[PDB]
């Protein structure tokens, strides 16, 4: 809303965008992961102080190492300790998105369960929850084959990223396409 307009001050800018970036963590969220960080809140905010963290939290939004942060933690963040949870939520979800984004590409779903889920480097008995929680994460679709140790999954995993299925895209999309013409040769032609 300010984006087009409204000249401001930095103490305004960062502190708000701090408080913003704070409120990201007092969001936390449907993750996020990545965000408006791209937008000129950064340098500007991060830089330093908690912005260091705040930025390193973007790292935590990727890294998801407790003690790359639970080291960092002072009161203000530990003031809401639930990021330790939220990071577990992160580490799951963080690991998840790409897994969801990438690992299967080949109609990505299964991710099922355990080692795959512990590939989040968050463990099986938490898989028994964090993984188990789905939209009890707020997100995951699908269900569980516990026996076979298999998630059923479906979407509600969006993202802003790029770079990848770009490639994979046209391949199949050329593939049928090509192999069309085989058929697509004479059908109406002949």
């Amino acid at each position: 809303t300010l984006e087009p307009s409204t000249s401001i001050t930095l103490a305004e800018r960062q502190q708000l965008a701090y408080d913003l970036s704070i409120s990201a963590l007092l969001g936390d969220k449907i993750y996020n992961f990545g965000e408006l960080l791209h937008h000129p809140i950064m340098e500007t905010i991060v830089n330093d102080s908690n912005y260091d963290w705040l930025f390193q939290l973007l790292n935590a939004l990727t890294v998801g190492d407790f003690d790359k942060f639970d080291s960092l933690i002072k009161v203000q963040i530990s003031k809401i300790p639930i990021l330790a949870q939220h990071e577990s939520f992160l580490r799951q979800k963080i690991c998840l998105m790409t897994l969801i984004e990438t690992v299967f590409v080949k109609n990505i779903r299964m991710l099922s369960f355990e080692d795959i889920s512990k590939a989040t480097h968050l463990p099986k008995d938490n898989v028994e929850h964090l993984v188990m929680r789905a939209i009890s994460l707020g997100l995951l679709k699908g269900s569980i084959d516990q026996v076979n140790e298999l998630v059923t999954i479906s979407w509600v995993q969006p993202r802003i990223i790029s770079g990848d299925q770009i490639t994979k895209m046209k391949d199949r999309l050329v593939e049928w396409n090509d192999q069309v013409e085989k058929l697509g040769k004479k059908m109406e032609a002949r």
């Binding site: 080949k106 790029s162 199949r172």
Partner: protein, 254 residues
């Protein structure tokens, strides 16, 4: 939202306008478009060339009068009340930001935010030679899809024109072609959000499941009619010449 009908009657004369105006790529023949704009579907009844001037040597520089429409609508009204201004057209095929300005003129003249109309005066590629836009906001403008109505009255004289499956395939490439590039475009154009917006639905493929069998199972019966499809042939034309020739090849009396 209010996505709209299209009047071919428009479309036709529209190019006549373009034709009449001898508008060229330098130019876009512009004009009213008519209908009634209330519903979540808007109709295009008609449309009217607005005698106009366009200069993109200076973008905002261009000339038009409303007062056509003024006298126009009167008659239009006097012609029909249902004319009520839905928006306007131009040639196009594409936008030029001055459109925005131009758009807003009609805002005075329209109920809703009025309706832009692009036309491809060369009708070049595909479905529609046409786009219809409504402004927006970080501005917005947008294309809601649109299409023809009946207008069978149209469709009939239409019928006097013209005169199975492989096509259906054929577009298969098309979007994909651009698509990947369109990334690589924007990728290496800006090397936006909407691309990722696309990215998700992508996995919506390799999706296929033994539900595949159903297909197979289904396809079976599809073929069962086979022995029947030509069975009647199998039986029908074969035993047909045996009753006409024996009659005939032997007819042959005197």
């Amino acid at each position: 939202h209010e996505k709209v009908t299209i009047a071919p009657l428009v479309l036709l004369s529209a190019l006549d306008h373009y034709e009449r105006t001898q508008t060229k790529e330098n130019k876009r023949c512009v004009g009213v478009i008519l209908g009634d704009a209330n519903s979540s579907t808007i109709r295009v009844t008609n449309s009217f060339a607005l005698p106009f001037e366009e200069d993109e040597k200076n973008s905002d520089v261009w000339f038009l009068d409303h007062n056509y429409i003024e006298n126009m609508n009167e008659m239009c009204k006097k012609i029909n009340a249902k004319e009520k201004l839905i928006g306007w057209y131009h040639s196009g095929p594409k936008l030029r930001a001055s459109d925005l300005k131009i758009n807003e003129l009609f805002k005075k003249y329209t109920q809703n935010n009025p309706l832009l109309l692009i036309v491809d005066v060369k009708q070049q590629g595909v479905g529609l030679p046409t786009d219809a836009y409504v402004a927006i906001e970080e501005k917005t403008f947008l294309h809601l899809p649109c299409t023809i109505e009946a207008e069978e009255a149209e469709e009939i004289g239409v019928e006097h024109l013209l005169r199975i499956r492989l096509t259906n395939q054929l577009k298969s490439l098309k979007g994909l072609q651009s698509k990947l590039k369109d990334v690589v475009e924007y990728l290496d154009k800006v090397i936006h959000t909407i691309l990722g917006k696309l990215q998700d639905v992508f996995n919506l493929n390799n999706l296929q499941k033994a539900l595949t069998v159903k297909t197979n199972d289904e396809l079976m019966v599809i073929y069962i009619s086979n022995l029947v499809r030509s069975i009647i042939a199998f039986d029908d034309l074969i035993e047909n010449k045996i009753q006409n020739k024996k009659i005939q090849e032997q007819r042959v009396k005197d």
